[PDB]
Design a protein around this ligand. Structure first.
Ligand SMILES: NC(=O)c1ccc[n+]([C@@H]2O[C@H](COP(=O)([O-])OP(=O)(O)OC[C@H]3O[C@@H](n4cnc5c(N)ncnc54)[C@H](O)[C@@H]3O)[C@@H](O)[C@H]2O)c1
Ligand SMILES: NC(=O)c1ccc[n+]([C@@H]2O[C@H](COP(=O)([O-])OP(=O)(O)OC[C@H]3O[C@@H](n4cnc5c(N)ncnc54)[C@H](O)[C@@H]3O)[C@@H](O)[C@H]2O)c1
Ligand SMILES: N=C(N)NCCCCN
Ligand SMILES: N=C(N)NCCCCN
Lengths: 474, 474
């Protein structure tokens, strides 16, 4: 007896049927009312076709490209009788162009990433700045400025980016309550930003530890991951990137800012998946994470910015990813960066291939009076198998966030282009929480200066343990 | 059947009965003639005691310390009737002090590391220079100058240091043939150095890839290795260290030299096991190694130094370790450095736990006319189990080098303090080769600049691919 949240009165066009599409389709079928023949999946892969045929769903074996996307998607999204929903879970497609097409035709839209057309991430004529998620996000912000309001389109609503924006709001509320600060929670963006400022939040890690492991050892010259290998390598080869807090007093020599845009970001002239940061999760305790670029690194810092009358930022948290992937992915990164090139083969771990483990994913708020607070999900593979098919624990955190964004978009269908920071976080977490396993908040007295300095000289700032100077591995 | 090289008539005193002692004792029993009652094993651990008793060998459950080593060891070393052999395969004991005791009492000596007394590797008042293997080795060189000749003591005769010195000589021979350099095979240190210089060898990696893996996955908060965890962690937390070649044109800002000594070394003010270098082996192809300090990095560069009349070095190869350990040790390093402290538990993989894999261990000579040449052993666990008990492939490469060193010392018992570079490499390899599996030379066109510059600006030296500037990972 699962809740059916809404009737969808139009076509459901799912672009992409890899690990996330495969975990999202059963949730869509479970939680929305629609005639089954309204749903069609689009993916160029033979593997995806065979799985879709086995699930009995309509399947169009085609790559969506700049040359064909209008021809293909417009008729599919406007088949009627009412408003359709474009669920974009693909690689190599332009989120912006597909979102703008959906909106022009009155269809709802959701995705989990601001993705460019094939050919972008490895174009040699591009500067590192132009390869940054800040630059991609700015194309979406400009599209919203050019066409405000209109049909709801939800950008970057997966686990991270996505759910972690809701966790930040919940964590801020909890931090205030744990101090005895009572009174209504924020309702506006400015109020959220000021809550973070008033609590003294210096920054936020998206602090993740994947402990899922397979029944076979990592094969030589095979990249192994629990979600998209292509997508992980793409973002891992983008510049390291972070939302940049007002409290930071140091940045590396190879860090750069941006001439234009929301003002919240810096990037480093080095690949994020080969950049390490010191961080912490409840199961990992102190660990290395990789400083992989993510939309929410910028979007959360932007959302939580307090400006003065003249428009300059007076407060902004640091925000970035601190990702410890599954052990086989750690080894895959060591192998890829060590060989200088991508492995000849790759595979994504299926739930049938996973022996145990969890995907621990939350937000680590630091610098406040209780030093650091981690809030998020500790979903295990064992629980995943019991509550949702066709995915591992990493996949279910993502697919259930897409579900929640879809509920929100159907309930708020005239909201325009929105990010996860713009949604009603309580409504979204109400939809998502049945799929998140243990959701817990944990304080720690760990800081990045724990145990330091050691037996070698280090450049550290002992007056401010959470300075990026102390977090970055150098 | 197996050759019995010599009769040993005196006591055989084995200090330490861990992974290497366990592998070396059966080879000693196989290849030397002696009454088993003349063996004596000294180790503080109960695990060692149970193993020794199972072998029916005399056992003393003591830790050898600065306070007790003269009182404990002299009666054992001088028990007669003949000359004794002290086989030191321990941790936390002073190689130098035990070696000098053995020589003072007419006993032969062999070890696989210049180890200091307990307390040194983590004394907070030691400057980084004093923690280097260069400095430890200089204490051995000083002892030789103080007491030339005398009873043979073989310093650092394992797989690496040890065997790889013999691989360097064989590789120089092979390169000379292949490049058409004419001349007699060297027979003195000065002739070997001149051969390296005439061949244009800019440098040498001790290039190693361990692919052994266990039937169980890496446990959380357990350091896993194929040999000493204590020993590996100790050397991994010493400064990164290398023999410094005359061709190098750049050193990092945190590199330092030495005021005194043989002059062949630099060290970096960072731990070697968290320092990566670009390297290459036949099985791994291009890979990261860790720049872990090792005696042979100095000893080989020193041995192959050519000087002019003024005693100034005019040629010297760069030489250093480029270690890719087994996958579980790679994960163990990521865990240890990421948490800032040693794991609470550790284990050494036993042959009964290893499912497959090899220990590929060789020397990569580079900068000559055929770019780079790797020469070494590709010993598999399957072959190891066929030919020797109680050890894995890593251990067998070490124990068989100790065996070769012992045979050499018996045939040359009044040669004074010697390193592996000073032994007759052909006799040593004649004893060792039955235990090395495939031993092969391979050329490659790979260089550290393959694929570079990439998508981000890099500080590289395009005039000479093999510069340390291009090898070191920043
Ligand atoms: N939390 C998050 O926000 C989050 C998490 C995971 C993944 N993602 C993103 O979601 C997307 C999918 O992840 P995944 O794990 O399912 O990836 P995946 O690699 O498993 O699958 C991607 C699918 O896209 C298909 N595809 C490729 N080119 C296409 C085209 N032109 N048109 C249509 N389909 C095409 C592929 O055939 C493949 O099946 C990725 O972009 C990834 O970066 C976001
Ligand atoms: N190729 C090489 O040159 C090479 C390779 C492997 C190991 N090694 C060195 O050989 C040594 C042994 O390696 P391992 O793998 O056998 O190590 P291990 O950790 O397995 O064993 C070390 C043994 O020494 C014993 N020990 C500790 N303190 C002692 C003391 N005070 N007196 C006597 N014994 C003591 C321990 O109880 C243990 O059994 C280490 O020093 C290691 O660095 C060299
Ligand atoms: N989320 C922000 N950064 N700003 C608020 C944008 C609100 C869009 N309706
Ligand atoms: N190996 C050296 N570096 N020098 C040679 C010294 C000879 C010792 N009997």
């Amino acid at each position: 007896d699962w809740p059916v949240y809404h009737r969808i009165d139009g076509p459901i066009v799912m672009i992409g049927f890899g690990s996330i599409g495969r975990g999202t389709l059963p949730l869509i079928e479970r939680h929305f009312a629609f005639d089954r023949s309204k749903l069609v999946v689009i993916d160029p892969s033979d593997e995806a076709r065979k799985l879709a045929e086995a699930r009995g769903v309509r399947f169009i074996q085609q790559a969506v490209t700049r040359d064909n996307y209008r021809e293909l998607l417009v008729p599919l999204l406007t088949a009627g009788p009412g408003q359709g929903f474009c669920v974009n879970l693909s690689v190599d497609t332009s989120s912006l162009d597909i979102m703008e097409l959906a909106r022009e035709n009155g269809a709802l839209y959701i995705d989990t990433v601001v993705e460019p057309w094939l050919g972008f991430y490895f174009d040699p004529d591009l500067k590192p700045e132009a390869r940054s998620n800040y630059a991609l996000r700015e194309t979406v912000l400009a599209a919203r400025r050019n066409k405000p309001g209109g049909t709801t389109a939800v950008s970057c609503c997966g686990a991270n980016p996505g759910m972690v924006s809701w966790f930040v709001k919940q964590a801020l509320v909890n931090l205030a309550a744990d101090l005895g600060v009572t009174g209504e929670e924020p309702t506006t963006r400015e109020e959220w930003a000021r809550l973070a400022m008033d609590l003294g939040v210096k920054g936020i890690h998206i602090a993740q530890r994947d402990t899922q492991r397979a029944s076979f050892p990592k094969p030589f010259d095979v990249f192994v991951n629990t979600w998209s290998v292509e997508g992980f390598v793409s973002e891992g080869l983008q510049p390291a990137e972070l939302g940049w807090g007002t409290f930071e007093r140091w940045m590396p020599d190879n860090a750069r800012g941006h001439d234009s845009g929301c003002g919240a970001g810096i990037y480093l002239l080095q690949p994020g998946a080969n950049t390490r940061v010191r961080s912490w999760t409840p199961t990992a305790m102190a660990q290395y994470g990789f400083l992989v670029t993510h939309n929410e690194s910028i979007s959360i810092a932007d959302f939580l910015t307090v400006r003065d009358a003249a428009g300059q930022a007076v407060y902004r948290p640091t925000c970035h990813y601190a990702y410890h992937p599954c052990n086989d992915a750690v080894l895959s990164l060591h192998e890829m960066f060590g060989s200088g090139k991508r492995q000849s083969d790759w595979r994504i771990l299926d739930e049938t291939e996973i022996v145990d483990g969890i995907d621990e994913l939350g937000v680590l708020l630091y610098g406040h009076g209780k030093n650091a607070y981690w809030y998020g999900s500790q979903l295990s593979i064992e629980e995943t198998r019991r509550i949702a098919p066709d995915q591992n624990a990493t996949g279910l955190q993502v697919s259930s966030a897409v579900l929640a964004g879809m509920v929100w978009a159907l309930e708020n269908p005239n909201a325009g282009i929105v990010e996860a920071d713009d949604l009603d976080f309580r409504r979204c977490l109400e939809v998502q929480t049945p799929y998140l396993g243990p959701v817990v908040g944990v304080y720690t007295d760990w800081t990045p200066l724990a145990g330091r300095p050691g037996l070698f000289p280090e450049d550290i700032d002992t007056s401010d343990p959470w300075q990026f100077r102390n977090v970055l591995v150098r």
